From a paper:
Non-structural protein 5 (NS5) is the largest viral protein, comprising the N-terminal methyltransferase (MTase) domain and the C-terminal RNA-dependent RNA polymerase (RdRp) domain. The RdRp domain is essential for both positive- and negative-strand RNA syntheses during replication. The structure of RdRp is often compared to a right hand, and is composed of three subdomains: thumb, fingers, and palm. The thumb subdomain contains a so-called priming loop, which extends into a double-stranded RNA binding site, and is hypothesized to undergo a conformational change during the de novo initiation of RNA synthesis.
In order to understand the inhibitory mechanism of RK-0404678, the crystal structures of the NS5 RdRp domains from DENV2 and DENV3 were determined in the complex form with RK-0404678 at 2.43 and 1.97 Å resolutions, respectively. The DENV2 RdRp structure revealed two RK-0404678 molecules bound to two distinct sites (Sites 1 and 2), while the DENV3 RdRp structure showed only one molecule of the compound bound to Site 1. In the DENV2 RdRp structure, the benzoxathiole ring of RK-0404678 is surrounded by the side chains of Cys780, Tyr882, Met809, Ser763, and Asp808, while the acetate group interacts with the side chains of Trp833, Arg773, Met883, and Asn777 (right). The DENV2 RdRp structure revealed the second binding site (Site 2) for RK-0404678. The benzoxathiole ring of RK-0404678 interacts with the side chains of Val507, Ser661, and Cys709 and the main chains of Glu510-Gly511. A comparison of the DENV2 RdRp structures with and without the bound RK-0404678 revealed that the compound binding induces a local conformational change in the RdRp. While Tyr607 on the α16 helix faces the catalytic center in the absence of the compound, it is flipped in the opposite direction upon compound binding. This change affects the structures of the α16-helix and its flanking loop, which are disordered in the presence of the compound. A cobalt ion included in the crystallization conditions occupies the space left after the flipping of the Tyr607 side chain.
Author numbering: 271 to 412, 418 to 455, 473 to 601, 604 to 791, 801 to 845, 848 to 886
Write the structure that this text describes.
């Protein structure tokens, strides 16, 4: 089942740009994706990640930690792409049963209606898009060189209009994904997607206020508070099951339910969004590279159901909200059979959604595929037939083994973190985020771009340091490492583009984020120094693999390393920041 009436125009346009080498490789490796052909291509990508030499020189004890080192070994060569494709992306998900589909359709229709109560969809503009391009951007493959180049060249916008008018007659020609697993599109295709669906992000449809379950806009320093509030609900344990490869488990049915947001639109906006949904989401064309004994080729493949990562405009959050409501329903015995929803069962679901729907959403904190649920009681743990039949198979657990929850919200994993209460010297109680400090250091030692000069490398380092001092100040090693990086990088250099991304005094930012603007901090008295700001317990702070001897030596000689970095940056002026205790 590949529908060439929808994808043929895209495939033929690519075939015609490489007619000489175009061919059908009878030994292609694709099993659940439809394969259309290959052509010869120049190898792109690389098999190493680039190391941030500034962060590395100031974090020398971590040169021997395995987690840290391994993180610097990403493979975007054809070899790497094909490795991840075979293991992760080339999977099939069964179609949900009839009953499951009915639950999803009812629940999705209800959810769009709740999200739309206080919001109205709208088209986003070329001007909105262009302003966002002048900053951090969603990721498209880039004929110009940068996104900021394309937005000014008005020929770029003629191409947009060309594709847009095809979209307006239900045809698609250039919206092709590239697996260079992350999927890129031409910036023009990204614009059309933004124009149709950007309102979901820009108008904050998944903020906690509008969606009850969501946390769009919250910010790491707020998530722990949000978890602790959810824990105040009456109910069972708190559950936080990860889905194995969520993007690959998005079904065609999921995509059709997300599309019901178009029922809330009108005019050409509805037509454009319908094009994004039917032409680019439910009928995708993907380019992947593959090594062959004859050099690297590009494969053209297609598939209807999965999702490709930029975010997903809240659609992953939407679908997870829907999926977790249905698991709540199943736990509460609202329905009995995935096989067939009886007429009286469809009415119960409708009643349940009308009666307790909003309350059940607020038992949840959901960010894309990341969810925390505090259900009515622990029947939830073994309500599994809808979850599995929807394809949202739980990671690292037997299919019918019941979920394990937690009674202590400080043990619940959410958004790659745990959250802890932390007592200040004056007795006020902070809720702070926590995650393995060897991961944080490993990610800081990776320069997110290839071929970078030392200034941008130093500014990326400073960005992590300021983030550490805001978010992970309670970790002794990170506070010290942040101090060194900030001492080593000229004080007026701007961190690369969030609260840590200026040259504001970071104590000023700390006070604003954790005291002044913290809705869960009643006493608005600021702190007057970093010595006033506490650490986690020395025990629980140990979490790190580094030896105590190499940490002590690192701490004792840290100024030697700082000066070494200062010398390579240049005859500049630097500030010696308050040394961590
Ligand atoms: C937009 C929002 O507030 O939701 C999230 C989800 C995951 C996450 O991981 C971080 O580092 S911050 C963060 C925020
Ligand atoms: C706890 C500590 O002293 O670490 C930092 C980190 C970043 C920063 O940015 C400034 O201007 S001050 C400052 C201190
Ligand atoms: Co050719
Ligand atoms: Co080529
Ligand atoms: Co996974
Ligand atoms: Co169909
Ligand atoms: Co209309
Ligand atoms: Co999302
Ligand atoms: Co009740
Ligand atoms: Co950052
Ligand atoms: Co509050
Ligand atoms: Zn298109
Ligand atoms: Zn911890």
């Amino acid at each position: 089942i590949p529908n060439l009436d929808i994808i043929g125009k895209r495939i033929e346009k690519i075939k015609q740009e490489h007619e000489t080498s175009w061919h059908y490789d009878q030994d292609h490796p694709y099993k659940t994706w439809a394969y259309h052909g290959s052509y010869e291509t120049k190898q792109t990508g690389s098999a190493s990640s680039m190391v941030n030499g500034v962060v590395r020189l100031l974090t020398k004890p971590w040169d021997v930690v395995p987690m840290v080192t391994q993180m610097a070994m990403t493979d975007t060569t054809p070899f790497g792409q094909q490795r991840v494709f075979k293991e992760k992306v080339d999977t099939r998900t069964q179609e949900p049963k009839e009953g499951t589909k009915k639950l999803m359709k009812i629940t999705a229709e209800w959810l769009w209606k709740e999200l739309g109560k206080k919001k109205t969809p709208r088209m986003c503009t070329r001007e909105e898009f262009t302003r966002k391009v002048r900053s951090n951007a969603a990721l498209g493959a880039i004929k110009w060189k940068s996104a900021r180049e394309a937005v000014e060249d008005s020929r770029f916008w003629e191409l947009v209009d060309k594709e847009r008018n095809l979209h307006l007659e239900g045809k698609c020609e250039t919206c092709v994904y590239n697996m260079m697993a992350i999927w890129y599109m031409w910036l023009g295709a990204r614009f059309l997607e933004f124009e149709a669906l950007g309102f979901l992000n820009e108008d904050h449809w998944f903020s906690r206020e509008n969606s009850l379950s969501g946390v769009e806009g919250e910010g790491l320093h707020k998530l722990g508070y949000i978890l602790r509030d959810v824990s105040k609900k009456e109910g069972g344990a708190m559950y936080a099951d990860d889905t194995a490869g969520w993007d690959t488990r998005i079904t065609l049915e999921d995509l059709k339910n997300e599309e019901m947001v178009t029922n809330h639109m009108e005019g050409e906006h509805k037509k454009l969004a319908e094009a994004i949904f039917k032409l680019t989401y439910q009928n995708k064309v993907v380019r992947v590279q593959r090594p062959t004994p004859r050099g690297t080729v590009m494969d053209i493949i297609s598939r209807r159901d999965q999702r490709g990562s930029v975010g997903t405009y809240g659609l992953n959050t939407f679908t997870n909200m829907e999926a977790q409501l249905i698991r709540q329903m199943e736990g509460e015995g609202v329905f009995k059979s995935i096989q067939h929803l009886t007429v009286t069962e469809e009415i119960a679901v409708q009643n349940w959604l009308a009666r307790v729907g909003r309350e059940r959403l607020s038992r949840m904190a959901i960010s894309g595929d990341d969810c925390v649920v505090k259900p009515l009681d622990d029947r939830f743990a073994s309500a599994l037939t809808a979850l599995n039949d929807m394809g949202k198979v739980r990671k690292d657990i037997q299919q019918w083994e019941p979920s394990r929850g937690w009674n202590d919200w400080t043990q619940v994993p959410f958004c790659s973190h745990h959250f802890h209460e932390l007592i200040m010297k004056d007795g006020r109680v902070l809720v702070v985020p926590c995650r393995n400090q060897d991961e944080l250091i490993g990610r800081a030692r990776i320069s997110q771009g290839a071929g970078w000069s030392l200034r941008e490398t130093a500014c990326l380092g400073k960005s992590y340091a300021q983030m550490w001092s805001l978010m992970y100040f309670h970790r002794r090693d990170l506070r010290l490492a942040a101090n060194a990086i900030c001492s080593a990088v000229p004080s007026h250099w701007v961190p690369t583009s969030h609260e840590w991304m200026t040259t504001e005094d970071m104590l000023t930012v700390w006070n604003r984020v954790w005291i002044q603007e913290n809705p869960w901090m009643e006493d608005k008295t600021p702190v007057e120094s970093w010595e006033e700001i506490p650490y986690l317990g020395k025990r629980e702070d140990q979490g790190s693999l580094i030896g105590l001897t190499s940490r002590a030596t690192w701490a004792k000689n840290i100024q030697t390393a700082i000066n070494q970095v200062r010398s390579l940056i240049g005859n500049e002026e630097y500030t010696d920041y308050m040394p961590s205790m």
